[PDB]
Design a protein around this ligand. Structure first.
Ligand SMILES: [Zn+2]
Ligand SMILES: [Zn+2]
Ligand SMILES: [Zn+2]
Ligand SMILES: [Zn+2]
Lengths: 262, 48
């Protein structure tokens, strides 16, 4: 559109005076734009030696025989010639007129274009497929990135549920044992002070033995009565065996195995 | 093997469509080093 008509570096409108030349890549730029062996395209490559550059013939709205123009098509040389060239150079070279050779060429280029156009219709469709596929690949990367993380947390959520419950189990056992122990230190010290008191008073009374028998022998009944209180005090300490060292379930080798796969 | 030649030369003309400045001799060595996969040639092309 706005560029097909325009030239190369200067992007002039096609001036036929400009002697514009059309490269094999079909790009067009006047010989003023590019002077310098093998000539290279401003966009593509040096696809062909300068010997394969035509001059663009676009002048909107013969090589040899001067003002005699070309109108006629030499069928034996793929290109056009004037009436003279087919008398000297192409004598009885089987030859054809412009009107028929152009009809066929137009109908073969329309075929090449109609098929090639049907082909670039699929790139216009497969470009969108690749464009949407990339977003999928990166979405299917950041969703697998989250499925693993949320699955790991669901495991750890339930494990801490059955990790704290076992801790609450040990919690229960110890206040139950402590309540038992606290009645066994309470029991000891109070019985001990009862034992201490009888031992205290009976010792002092017995230890004073210098003409003190008259005071002692009047209280023998209550001495030996309260000795029966301490003859049978009736507690014996039990021992709660420690088994919490063996209520830790250390199956460590199993933990790595199931962590290895996932 | 004349079929095999055109299937090789087909892939060559496309590198010139993409990266053209490098020579026709250089691209031919890479389209054998790749075994004429349509994509993996354009892979090694960018690498050099
Ligand atoms: Zn120009
Ligand atoms: Zn070009
Ligand atoms: Zn001829
Ligand atoms: Zn002539």
């Amino acid at each position: 559109l706005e560029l097909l008509e325009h030239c190369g570096v200067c992007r002039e409108r096609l001036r036929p005076e400009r002697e514009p030349r059309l490269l094999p890549c079909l790009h067009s730029a006047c010989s003023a734009c590019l002077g310098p062996t093998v000539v290279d395209c401003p966009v593509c490559k040096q696809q062909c030696f300068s010997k394969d550059i035509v001059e663009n013939y676009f002048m909107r709205d013969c090589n040899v025989h001067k003002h005699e123009p070309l109108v006629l098509f030499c069928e034996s040389c793929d290109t056009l010639t004037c009436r003279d060239c087919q008398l000297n150079a192409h004598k009885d070279h089987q030859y054809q007129f412009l009107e028929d050779a152009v009809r066929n060429q137009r109908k073969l280029l329309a075929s090449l274009v109609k098929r090639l156009g049907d082909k670039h219709a699929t790139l216009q469709k497969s470009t969108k497929e690749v464009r949407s596929s990339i977003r999928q690949v990166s979405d299917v990367q950041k969703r697998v990135q989250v499925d693993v993380k949320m699955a790991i947390l669901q495991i750890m959520k339930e494990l801490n549920k059955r990790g704290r419950v076992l801790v609450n189990d040990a919690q229960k056992v110890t206040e139950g044992q402590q309540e038992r122990l606290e009645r066994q230190h309470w029991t000891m010290t109070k019985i001990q002070k009862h034992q201490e008191h009888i031992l205290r008073f009976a010792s002092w009374a017995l230890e004073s033995d210098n003409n003190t028998a008259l005071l002692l022998s009047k209280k023998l009944i209550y001495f030996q009565l309260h000795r029966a209180l301490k003859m049978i005090v009736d507690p014996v300490e039990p021992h709660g065996e420690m088994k919490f060292q063996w209520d830790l379930n250390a199956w460590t080798k199993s933990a790595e195995a199931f962590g290895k796969i996932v | 093997l004349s079929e095999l030649e055109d299937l090789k030369d087909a892939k060559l003309q496309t590198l010139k469509e993409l990266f053209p400045q490098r020579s026709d001799n250089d691209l031919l060595k890479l389209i054998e080093s790749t075994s004429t996969m349509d994509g993996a040639i354009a892979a090694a092309l960018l690498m050099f």
